[PDB]
Amino acid sequence: AIIKEFMRFKVRMEGSVNGHEFEIEGEGEGRPYEGTQTAKLKVTKGGPLPFAWDILTPNFSKAYVKHPADIPDYLKLSFPEGFKWERVMNFEDGGVVTVTQDSSLQDGEFIYKVKLRGTMFPSDGPVMQKKTMGWEASSERMYPEDGALKGEIKMRLKLKDGGHYDAEVKTTYKAKKPVQLPGAYIVGIKLDITSHNEDYTIVELYERAEGRHSTGGMDELY
C-alpha cells in the first residue's frame, strides 16, 4: 500500500485575489479510504485577507475520496508520482478564480502546491465584503476525457443574509503517469470551516467526500 489508511499532508498556496497578494501554509490529515479529512491553515503573508476565505477552501485533496471497488480510484492510483489539477470557478457575479495545483508524495506525506488567482470580483460583492457563510454540500459530476479526469460542479455558497451565491466549477485532474481512468460517476462532497480565529488568520476545515454511481443525471438531473 502506497496510500495508507491514515495519511497526512502539507500544503502551500500562493495567490492573489483582486490584486491582493497572500500566502498560506497548512497541514492536514485524514483517512483516504474513508473519505474524511481535516486541515489547519495559517495565513503566512498578506493577512488579514480582505476577502472571504470561502473562495479559497475548496482549494485545500483528491486522494481522500472514498470509492467503491467498482469505480477505479484514478487519483489514488496516480501515487507515488501523484497528479496535477487545474480549475476554473466562474462566480455568478463575474468573479473568477483560476487554480493550478500539484500533488505529490514525499516521505509518506502528501505535498500540495497551489497557485490561485481571483479576479473581477465586484468591490461591493459578498466575496470582497466578506458576507459568505460556508458552502452547501456539492455533487461533482465526473467523466474521463483526453486522458484525464474531468469534474463539473455547480457550487452554492450560503450568504450571511439568507441568500446564496453560485459558481460554475470545472476541473481537470491528471495523473503524472497513465493509470486507470474510471467511467462517469458522481462525488458527494461537504466542506466546512470548523474553526477560525478572531481575525481569520487561522482556520480549520473538515471535508467528507464519497464517490458513487450516477443514476443517469450528470447535468440537471443528478
Method used to obtain the model: X-ray
* C-alpha span between 129 and 54 (Å, rounded): 12
Cell triple for 151: 469534474
Distance CA 83, CA 56 (A): 20
Q: Is there a contact between 85 and 103 (Cβ–Cβ < 8 Å)?
A: yes
Torsion angle, CA of 109/213/152/4, rounded to 10 degrees? 0
Domains plus CATH for the chain? 1-222 (2.40.155.10)
Distances (CA, A) of 76 to 13, 28, 79, 96: 22, 17, 6, 29
> What gap in Å lies between CA 142 and CA 112, rounded to an integer?
22
The resolution, in angstroms to one decimal, equals 1.6
